[PDB]
Amino acid sequence: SDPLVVAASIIGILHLILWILDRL
Amino acid sequence: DPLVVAASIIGILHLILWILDRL
Amino acid sequence: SDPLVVAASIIGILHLILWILDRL
Amino acid sequence: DPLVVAASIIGILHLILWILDRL
Ligand SMILES: N[C@H]1CCC2(CC1)[C@H]1C[C@@H]3C[C@@H](C[C@H]2C3)C1
Ligand SMILES: [Cl-]
């Protein structure tokens, strides 16, 4: 696997979750 | 990879929800 | 990789650009 | 892939700047 792509994917999922919960 | 795919869809979805949240 | 990953990449670059500009 | 690497770097930077901007 690609460490950078894994980290960016996880960070991206976390980003949407935190943004949603912030907008609620 | 299901992670890469899921994060790809989630990334596209994130921009959509952001634009609509801003407009 | 595939057109999904490409599209999400382009869309992620676009997202940061538009967020920075919307934030200025 | 260059585009994927750049988007990975940009995605990480995006979250960091968003969190900070929000605080
Ligand atoms: N919000 C971003 C959009 C771009 C990606 C990170 C999250 C996403 C997951 C991986 C694979 C591509 C490029 C980045 C890494 C699509
Ligand atoms: Cl915002």
CA distance A16 to chain B (A): 6
Of A7, A18, A22, which has the smallest distance from its Cβ to D12's Cβ? A7
Q: How far is CA B13 from CA A1, A3, B9, B19, D1, in A?
A: 24, 23, 6, 10, 22
* Helix (H) / strand (E) containing A1: none
Q: How was this structure determined?
A: X-ray
Resolution (angstroms) stands at 2.6
Maximum Cα interatomic distance, chain A, rounded to a whole number of Å? 35
What whole-number distance in Å separates Cα of residue A17 and Cα of residue A4?
A: 20
